[PDB]
PDB file of C-alpha atoms and ligand atoms in Angstrom:
ATOM      1  CA  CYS K   1      75.985 156.680 153.147  1.00 28.62           C
ATOM      2  CA  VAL K   2      74.810 157.961 156.530  1.00 30.08           C
ATOM      3  CA  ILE K   3      76.632 155.329 158.616  1.00 27.82           C
ATOM      4  CA  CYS K   4      79.859 157.058 157.535  1.00 26.43           C
ATOM      5  CA  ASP K   5      79.144 159.541 160.345  1.00 25.43           C
ATOM      6  CA  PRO K   6      80.763 159.020 163.805  1.00 26.67           C
ATOM      7  CA  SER K   7      77.647 160.453 165.495  1.00 29.13           C
ATOM      8  CA  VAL K   8      75.142 158.005 164.002  1.00 27.67           C
ATOM      9  CA  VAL K   9      77.016 154.992 165.363  1.00 27.45           C
ATOM     10  CA  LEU K  10      77.137 156.782 168.725  1.00 27.49           C
ATOM     11  CA  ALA K  11      73.371 157.225 168.617  1.00 27.18           C
ATOM     12  CA  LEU K  12      73.103 153.505 167.849  1.00 31.82           C
ATOM     13  CA  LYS K  13      75.396 152.372 170.669  1.00 28.56           C
ATOM     14  CA  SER K  14      73.413 154.607 173.009  1.00 26.93           C
ATOM     15  CA  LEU K  15      70.224 153.272 171.414  1.00 26.74           C
ATOM     16  CA  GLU K  16      71.038 149.676 172.265  1.00 27.53           C
ATOM     17  CA  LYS K  17      72.825 150.171 175.592  1.00 27.29           C
ATOM     18  CA  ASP K  18      70.565 152.922 176.966  1.00 29.20           C
ATOM     19  CA  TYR K  19      67.170 152.663 175.240  1.00 30.28           C
ATOM     20  CA  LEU K  20      66.906 148.971 174.320  1.00 28.66           C
ATOM     21  CA  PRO K  21      67.030 147.626 177.914  1.00 28.67           C
ATOM     22  CA  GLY K  22      64.062 149.492 179.369  1.00 31.19           C
ATOM     23  CA  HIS K  23      61.819 149.145 176.331  1.00 30.49           C
ATOM     24  CA  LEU K  24      62.657 145.779 174.750  1.00 30.38           C
ATOM     25  CA  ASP K  25      62.787 142.177 175.957  1.00 29.04           C
ATOM     26  CA  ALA K  26      66.372 140.892 175.981  1.00 28.56           C
ATOM     27  CA  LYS K  27      65.044 137.823 174.182  1.00 28.86           C
ATOM     28  CA  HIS K  28      65.063 140.145 171.168  1.00 28.96           C
ATOM     29  CA  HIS K  29      67.872 142.617 171.938  1.00 31.10           C
ATOM     30  CA  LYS K  30      71.029 141.752 169.979  1.00 31.84           C
ATOM     31  CA  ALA K  31      68.759 140.143 167.379  1.00 30.95           C
ATOM     32  CA  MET K  32      67.180 143.486 166.532  1.00 32.85           C
ATOM     33  CA  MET K  33      70.265 145.711 166.386  1.00 31.86           C
ATOM     34  CA  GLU K  34      71.395 143.499 163.502  1.00 30.58           C
ATOM     35  CA  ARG K  35      68.306 144.278 161.424  1.00 33.81           C
ATOM     36  CA  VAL K  36      68.548 147.932 162.445  1.00 29.19           C
ATOM     37  CA  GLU K  37      72.246 148.556 161.731  1.00 31.75           C
ATOM     38  CA  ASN K  38      71.867 146.736 158.428  1.00 32.78           C
ATOM     39  CA  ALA K  39      68.844 148.923 157.671  1.00 31.45           C
ATOM     40  CA  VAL K  40      71.038 151.972 158.291  1.00 29.44           C
ATOM     41  CA  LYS K  41      73.868 150.471 156.249  1.00 29.85           C
ATOM     42  CA  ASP K  42      71.362 150.013 153.360  1.00 31.57           C
ATOM     43  CA  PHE K  43      71.024 153.802 152.944  1.00 30.15           C
ATOM     44  CA  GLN K  44      74.087 153.176 150.801  1.00 30.21           C
ATOM     45  CA  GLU K  45      72.002 151.034 148.436  1.00 29.79           C
ATOM     46  CA  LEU K  46      69.518 153.404 146.802  1.00 28.70           C
ATOM     47  CA  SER K  47      68.416 154.699 143.405  1.00 28.76           C
ATOM     48  CA  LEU K  48      66.236 157.461 142.005  1.00 30.01           C
ATOM     49  CA  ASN K  49      64.969 157.938 138.462  1.00 32.63           C
ATOM     50  CA  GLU K  50      65.821 160.985 136.308  1.00 32.32           C
ATOM     51  CA  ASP K  51      69.480 160.224 137.121  1.00 30.34           C
ATOM     52  CA  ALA K  52      71.973 157.466 137.885  1.00 33.05           C
ATOM     53  CA  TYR K  53      73.565 156.931 141.294  1.00 33.32           C
ATOM     54  CA  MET K  54      77.186 158.029 141.679  1.00 34.86           C
ATOM     55  CA  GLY K  55      77.336 156.302 145.055  1.00 35.28           C
ATOM     56  CA  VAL K  56      79.141 159.339 146.396  1.00 35.62           C
ATOM     57  CA  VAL K  57      78.259 162.317 148.611  1.00 34.97           C
ATOM     58  CA  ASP K  58      79.787 165.336 150.331  1.00 35.38           C
ATOM     59  CA  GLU K  59      80.080 166.210 154.025  1.00 35.91           C
ATOM     60  CA  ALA K  60      77.345 168.811 153.576  1.00 32.92           C
ATOM     61  CA  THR K  61      74.963 166.095 152.358  1.00 35.09           C
ATOM     62  CA  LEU K  62      76.048 163.444 154.870  1.00 34.27           C
ATOM     63  CA  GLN K  63      75.309 165.844 157.722  1.00 34.25           C
ATOM     64  CA  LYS K  64      71.750 166.398 156.484  1.00 35.16           C
ATOM     65  CA  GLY K  65      71.086 162.672 156.261  1.00 33.46           C
ATOM     66  CA  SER K  66      72.558 162.053 159.695  1.00 35.00           C
ATOM     67  CA  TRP K  67      70.691 165.009 161.239  1.00 39.63           C
ATOM     68  CA  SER K  68      67.282 164.414 159.624  1.00 38.97           C
ATOM     69  CA  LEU K  69      67.654 160.774 160.683  1.00 41.19           C
ATOM     70  CA  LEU K  70      68.766 161.276 164.303  1.00 41.18           C
ATOM     71  CA  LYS K  71      66.069 163.907 164.894  1.00 39.12           C
ATOM     72  CA  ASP K  72      63.252 161.432 164.246  1.00 39.37           C
ATOM     73  CA  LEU K  73      64.954 158.721 166.288  1.00 42.23           C
ATOM     74  CA  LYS K  74      64.933 161.309 169.037  1.00 48.55           C
ATOM     75  CA  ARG K  75      61.193 161.722 168.388  1.00 52.22           C
ATOM     76  CA  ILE K  76      60.804 157.951 168.813  1.00 51.68           C
ATOM     77  CA  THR K  77      62.735 157.722 172.081  1.00 51.44           C
ATOM     78  CA  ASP K  78      61.095 160.899 173.421  1.00 54.06           C
ATOM     79  CA  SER K  79      57.641 159.388 172.891  1.00 56.60           C
ATOM     80  CA  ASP K  80      58.701 156.556 175.243  1.00 57.80           C
ATOM     81  CA  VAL K  81      56.860 153.979 173.129  1.00 55.07           C
ATOM     82  CA  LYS K  82      58.047 150.521 174.136  1.00 55.27           C
ATOM     83  CA  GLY K  83      55.842 147.706 172.847  1.00 53.57           C
ATOM     84  CA  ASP K  84      55.821 145.595 169.701  1.00 57.65           C
ATOM     85  CA  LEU K  85      54.965 149.045 168.326  1.00 55.59           C
ATOM     86  CA  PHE K  86      58.465 150.437 168.958  1.00 55.81           C
ATOM     87  CA  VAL K  87      59.846 147.931 166.451  1.00 55.44           C
ATOM     88  CA  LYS K  88      57.145 149.025 163.973  1.00 57.11           C
ATOM     89  CA  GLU K  89      57.620 152.801 164.202  1.00 56.59           C
ATOM     90  CA  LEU K  90      61.401 152.425 164.224  1.00 55.07           C
ATOM     91  CA  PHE K  91      61.394 150.731 160.825  1.00 56.87           C
ATOM     92  CA  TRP K  92      58.612 152.825 159.295  1.00 56.15           C
ATOM     93  CA  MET K  93      60.838 155.770 160.142  1.00 59.85           C
ATOM     94  CA  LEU K  94      63.830 153.805 158.823  1.00 60.14           C
ATOM     95  CA  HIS K  95      61.990 153.541 155.470  1.00 61.53           C
ATOM     96  CA  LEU K  96      60.874 157.170 155.258  1.00 62.82           C
ATOM     97  CA  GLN K  97      64.336 158.507 156.097  1.00 54.88           C
ATOM     98  CA  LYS K  98      65.681 156.325 153.308  1.00 57.34           C
ATOM     99  CA  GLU K  99      63.274 158.206 151.037  1.00 58.04           C
ATOM    100  CA  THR K 100      64.299 161.643 152.362  1.00 58.09           C
ATOM    101  CA  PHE K 101      67.997 160.845 152.198  1.00 57.72           C
ATOM    102  CA  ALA K 102      67.472 159.594 148.645  1.00 60.01           C
ATOM    103  CA  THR K 103      66.037 163.013 147.764  1.00 55.95           C
ATOM    104  CA  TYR K 104      69.109 164.632 149.347  1.00 56.71           C
ATOM    105  CA  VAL K 105      71.492 162.467 147.323  1.00 59.38           C
ATOM    106  CA  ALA K 106      69.479 163.474 144.245  1.00 58.05           C
ATOM    107  CA  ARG K 107      69.820 167.215 144.916  1.00 56.98           C
ATOM    108  CA  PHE K 108      73.547 166.674 145.480  1.00 55.48           C
ATOM    109  CA  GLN K 109      74.177 165.182 142.034  1.00 56.55           C
ATOM    110  CA  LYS K 110      71.842 167.655 140.358  1.00 57.52           C
ATOM    111  CA  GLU K 111      73.423 170.776 141.874  1.00 58.51           C
ATOM    112  CA  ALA K 112      76.424 170.348 144.190  1.00 57.11           C
ATOM    113  CA  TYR K 113      78.356 167.665 142.288  1.00 57.66           C
ATOM    114  CA  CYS K 114      81.109 169.576 140.466  1.00 57.11           C
ATOM    115  CA  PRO K 115      79.079 172.814 140.251  1.00 60.76           C
ATOM    116  CA  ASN K 116      81.782 174.826 138.487  1.00 61.63           C
ATOM    117  CA  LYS K 117      81.011 176.181 135.035  1.00 62.64           C
ATOM    118  CA  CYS K 118      84.756 176.641 134.675  1.00 61.88           C
ATOM    119  CA  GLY K 119      88.195 175.887 136.085  1.00 63.14           C
ATOM    120  CA  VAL K 120      89.265 173.153 138.490  1.00 61.56           C
ATOM    121  CA  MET K 121      87.388 172.398 141.713  1.00 62.79           C
ATOM    122  CA  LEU K 122      88.869 169.954 144.210  1.00 65.35           C
ATOM    123  CA  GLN K 123      85.761 168.546 145.878  1.00 67.92           C
ATOM    124  CA  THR K 124      86.019 166.186 148.849  1.00 67.52           C
ATOM    125  CA  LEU K 125      83.705 163.259 148.231  1.00 63.16           C
ATOM    126  CA  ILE K 126      82.747 160.298 150.384  1.00 62.98           C
ATOM    127  CA  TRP K 127      82.385 156.853 148.860  1.00 64.45           C
ATOM    128  CA  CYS K 128      79.258 155.497 150.503  1.00 64.00           C
ATOM    129  CA  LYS K 129      80.038 151.793 150.169  1.00 61.64           C
ATOM    130  CA  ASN K 130      83.248 151.959 152.193  1.00 62.18           C
ATOM    131  CA  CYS K 131      82.699 155.293 153.972  1.00 64.81           C
ATOM    132  CA  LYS K 132      85.990 156.551 152.551  1.00 64.86           C
ATOM    133  CA  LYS K 133      87.182 159.967 151.407  1.00 64.38           C
ATOM    134  CA  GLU K 134      88.688 161.012 148.088  1.00 63.58           C
ATOM    135  CA  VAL K 135      89.415 164.411 146.571  1.00 65.35           C
ATOM    136  CA  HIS K 136      87.720 164.642 143.180  1.00 64.03           C
ATOM    137  CA  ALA K 137      89.007 166.996 140.487  1.00 63.59           C
ATOM    138  CA  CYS K 138      86.131 168.711 138.689  1.00 62.55           C
ATOM    139  CA  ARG K 139      87.476 170.041 135.397  1.00 65.90           C
ATOM    140  CA  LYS K 140      85.830 172.463 132.978  1.00 61.76           C
ATOM    141  CA  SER K 141      86.804 175.500 130.870  1.00 61.67           C
ATOM    142  CA  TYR K 142      90.389 176.721 131.308  1.00 60.76           C
ATOM    143  CA  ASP K 143      89.516 180.414 131.519  1.00 59.62           C
ATOM    144  CA  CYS K 144      86.135 181.009 133.155  1.00 65.06           C
ATOM    145  CA  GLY K 145      85.090 184.095 131.241  1.00 62.78           C
ATOM    146  CA  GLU K 146      85.656 187.790 130.727  1.00 62.75           C
ATOM    147  CA  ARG K 147      84.336 190.553 132.964  1.00 63.71           C
ATOM    148  CA  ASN K 148      83.486 193.985 131.604  1.00 60.06           C
ATOM    149  CA  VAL K 149      83.988 196.540 134.354  1.00 60.03           C
ATOM    150  CA  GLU K 150      82.897 200.134 133.852  1.00 63.71           C
ATOM    151  CA  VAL K 151      83.710 202.576 136.622  1.00 62.59           C
ATOM    152  CA  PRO K 152      83.314 206.329 136.891  1.00 61.61           C
ATOM    153  CA  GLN K 153      86.429 208.373 137.683  1.00 58.86           C
ATOM    154  CA  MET K 154      86.994 209.202 141.376  1.00 55.90           C
ATOM    155  CA  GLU K 155      84.899 206.161 142.293  1.00 51.87           C
ATOM    156  CA  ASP K 156      86.477 203.052 143.797  1.00 50.14           C
ATOM    157  CA  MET K 157      87.320 200.229 141.403  1.00 50.36           C
ATOM    158  CA  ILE K 158      86.491 196.744 142.678  1.00 50.63           C
ATOM    159  CA  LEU K 159      87.584 193.618 140.804  1.00 51.85           C
ATOM    160  CA  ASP K 160      86.090 190.368 142.098  1.00 52.87           C
ATOM    161  CA  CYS K 161      87.696 187.038 141.200  1.00 57.45           C
ATOM    162  CA  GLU K 162      85.550 185.008 143.602  1.00 58.48           C
ATOM    163  CA  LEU K 163      83.014 182.417 142.475  1.00 56.92           C
ATOM    164  CA  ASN K 164      80.255 180.656 144.433  1.00 58.43           C
ATOM    165  CA  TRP K 165      82.308 177.448 144.536  1.00 59.50           C
ATOM    166  CA  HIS K 166      85.726 178.749 145.644  1.00 58.79           C
ATOM    167  CA  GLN K 167      84.571 178.619 149.267  1.00 57.30           C
ATOM    168  CA  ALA K 168      83.969 174.902 148.716  1.00 55.14           C
ATOM    169  CA  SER K 169      87.079 174.037 146.699  1.00 53.77           C
ATOM    170  CA  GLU K 170      90.259 172.712 148.312  1.00 50.44           C
ATOM    171  CA  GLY K 171      94.037 172.974 148.069  1.00 51.63           C
ATOM    172  CA  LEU K 172      93.668 176.644 147.192  1.00 49.30           C
ATOM    173  CA  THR K 173      96.589 179.063 147.116  1.00 50.20           C
ATOM    174  CA  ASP K 174      96.330 182.860 146.982  1.00 46.12           C
ATOM    175  CA  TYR K 175      94.553 185.175 144.583  1.00 45.56           C
ATOM    176  CA  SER K 176      96.984 186.939 142.264  1.00 47.11           C
ATOM    177  CA  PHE K 177      96.015 190.096 140.386  1.00 44.15           C
ATOM    178  CA  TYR K 178      98.235 190.839 137.386  1.00 45.05           C
ATOM    179  CA  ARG K 179      98.126 193.868 135.080  1.00 42.37           C
ATOM    180  CA  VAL K 180      98.260 193.350 131.297  1.00 42.00           C
ATOM    181  CA  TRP K 181      99.432 195.873 128.701  1.00 41.00           C
ATOM    182  CA  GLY K 182     100.633 196.362 125.170  1.00 39.75           C
ATOM    183  CA  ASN K 183     104.188 195.753 126.370  1.00 36.20           C
ATOM    184  CA  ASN K 184     103.325 192.060 126.214  1.00 37.79           C
ATOM    185  CA  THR K 185     104.495 192.136 129.793  1.00 36.10           C
ATOM    186  CA  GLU K 186     102.380 192.041 132.914  1.00 37.83           C
ATOM    187  CA  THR K 187     103.103 193.075 136.486  1.00 36.15           C
ATOM    188  CA  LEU K 188     101.557 191.404 139.508  1.00 38.54           C
ATOM    189  CA  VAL K 189      99.527 194.116 141.261  1.00 40.95           C
ATOM    190  CA  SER K 190      98.212 192.143 144.231  1.00 40.52           C
ATOM    191  CA  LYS K 191      98.658 188.747 145.873  1.00 39.45           C
ATOM    192  CA  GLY K 192      96.906 187.484 148.972  1.00 40.99           C
ATOM    193  CA  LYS K 193      93.926 185.564 150.292  1.00 43.34           C
ATOM    194  CA  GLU K 194      91.675 188.483 149.410  1.00 43.53           C
ATOM    195  CA  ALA K 195      89.411 187.585 146.494  1.00 44.41           C
ATOM    196  CA  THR K 196      89.096 191.213 145.413  1.00 42.70           C
ATOM    197  CA  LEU K 197      91.338 194.008 144.140  1.00 43.47           C
ATOM    198  CA  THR K 198      90.213 197.493 145.150  1.00 44.30           C
ATOM    199  CA  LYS K 199      91.879 200.576 143.692  1.00 39.82           C
ATOM    200  CA  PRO K 200      90.507 203.867 145.074  1.00 41.16           C
ATOM    201  CA  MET K 201      90.191 207.145 143.146  1.00 40.92           C
ATOM    202  CA  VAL K 202      90.387 205.389 139.774  1.00 41.06           C
ATOM    203  CA  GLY K 203      91.907 207.370 136.905  1.00 43.14           C
ATOM    204  CA  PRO K 204      92.269 207.189 133.093  1.00 40.12           C
ATOM    205  CA  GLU K 205      95.546 205.365 133.780  1.00 40.74           C
ATOM    206  CA  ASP K 206      93.820 202.790 135.992  1.00 41.15           C
ATOM    207  CA  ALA K 207      91.609 201.786 133.065  1.00 44.01           C
ATOM    208  CA  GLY K 208      92.822 198.900 130.910  1.00 47.83           C
ATOM    209  CA  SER K 209      92.888 195.123 131.325  1.00 48.71           C
ATOM    210  CA  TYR K 210      93.685 193.047 134.412  1.00 51.95           C
ATOM    211  CA  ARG K 211      93.852 189.335 135.165  1.00 50.44           C
ATOM    212  CA  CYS K 212      93.129 187.240 138.247  1.00 48.99           C
ATOM    213  CA  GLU K 213      94.652 183.822 138.856  1.00 48.27           C
ATOM    214  CA  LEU K 214      93.469 181.803 141.842  1.00 46.97           C
ATOM    215  CA  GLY K 215      96.365 179.502 142.651  1.00 46.51           C
ATOM    216  CA  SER K 216      96.099 175.870 143.697  1.00 47.32           C
ATOM    217  CA  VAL K 217      98.536 173.697 145.647  1.00 46.87           C
ATOM    218  CA  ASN K 218     101.038 171.961 143.356  1.00 44.66           C
ATOM    219  CA  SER K 219      98.909 172.564 140.255  1.00 44.51           C
ATOM    220  CA  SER K 220      97.639 174.995 137.629  1.00 42.94           C
ATOM    221  CA  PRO K 221      95.274 177.756 138.842  1.00 44.68           C
ATOM    222  CA  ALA K 222      91.745 176.787 139.857  1.00 43.92           C
ATOM    223  CA  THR K 223      90.340 179.944 138.281  1.00 43.64           C
ATOM    224  CA  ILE K 224      91.468 182.540 135.740  1.00 44.88           C
ATOM    225  CA  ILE K 225      89.383 185.640 135.034  1.00 42.28           C
ATOM    226  CA  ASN K 226      90.142 188.545 132.702  1.00 41.74           C
ATOM    227  CA  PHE K 227      88.871 191.999 133.602  1.00 40.40           C
ATOM    228  CA  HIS K 228      88.406 194.747 131.032  1.00 38.85           C
ATOM    229  CA  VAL K 229      88.075 198.018 132.915  1.00 38.77           C
ATOM    230  CA  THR K 230      87.001 201.310 131.358  1.00 34.43           C
ATOM    231  CA  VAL K 231      86.417 204.635 133.089  1.00 33.10           C
ATOM    232  CA  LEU K 232      83.668 207.264 132.794  1.00 34.94           C
ATOM    233  CA  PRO K 233      83.785 210.877 134.040  1.00 35.37           C
ATOM    234  CA  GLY K 234      80.249 210.994 135.489  1.00 35.58           C
ATOM    235  CA  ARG K 235      79.791 212.213 139.071  1.00 36.82           C
TER     236      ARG K 235
HETATM  237  C1  NAG N   1     105.150 198.729 129.917  1.00 38.79           C
HETATM  238  O1  NAG N   1     104.624 200.004 130.276  1.00 38.79           O
HETATM  239  C2  NAG N   1     104.918 200.401 131.628  1.00 38.79           C
HETATM  240  C3  NAG N   1     104.302 201.766 131.801  1.00 38.79           C
HETATM  241  O2  NAG N   1     104.111 202.394 130.541  1.00 38.79           O
HETATM  242  C4  NAG N   1     106.424 200.413 131.869  1.00 38.79           C
HETATM  243  O3  NAG N   1     106.663 200.601 133.261  1.00 38.79           O
HETATM  244  C5  NAG N   1     107.055 199.081 131.463  1.00 38.79           C
HETATM  245  O4  NAG N   1     108.466 199.172 131.534  1.00 38.79           O
HETATM  246  C6  NAG N   1     106.645 198.763 130.032  1.00 38.79           C
HETATM  247  N1  NAG N   1     107.222 197.492 129.597  1.00 38.79           N
HETATM  248  C7  NAG N   1     108.104 197.414 128.574  1.00 38.79           C
HETATM  249  C8  NAG N   1     108.466 198.697 127.924  1.00 38.79           C
HETATM  250  O5  NAG N   1     108.560 196.333 128.213  1.00 38.79           O
END
């Protein structure tokens, strides 16, 4: 999907206009950029066993492909090779980088494709065929889990509602920390773009059960976590 990157096509324009003249006969100049640009546009068409091929990536993965690719092209041009060898090395490289990029696209589906064990993650994906963006809703468990927090008295209580994938989700509203009781009622204790609720000098009254809802834009919360806090008198 690499050609979906504005910098690759720049490197190609500069490749033809600035590197092709000095090092390639013009009898073969526009006739080669065809083969090349279609070899780049073929990165889209891959496959690797042990999985299918979603035909989709993320910015994080596109940037690796583009980088890893343009680095070696830079190796090529830096060498100043210019014969009927230039056209050999260029495409050997063009094969190998297809391999490497294929590995990248594998790691992406295996690990970074909807990596939430719970909640709703809005993940920006790029369709490789048409180089176009869509926001994909990754849906899993409603409530992520339950945290058991034990804290000694006079220590600081720290409730964390942040997960490894919140920094990568989108359309996120604030974190809200509510307080639940027997009253059946609950009072919002905190609300902001801080993923943690810290209450200093915890007491027997601070113990109980809290809840954290990470809001999303025009939707249900991305994450809900229930904290069960209990207090010890040690120290
Ligand atoms: C729940 O308890 C708190 C403190 O005990 C109190 O402020 C609140 O009014 C209670 N809710 C009821 C009684 O509905």
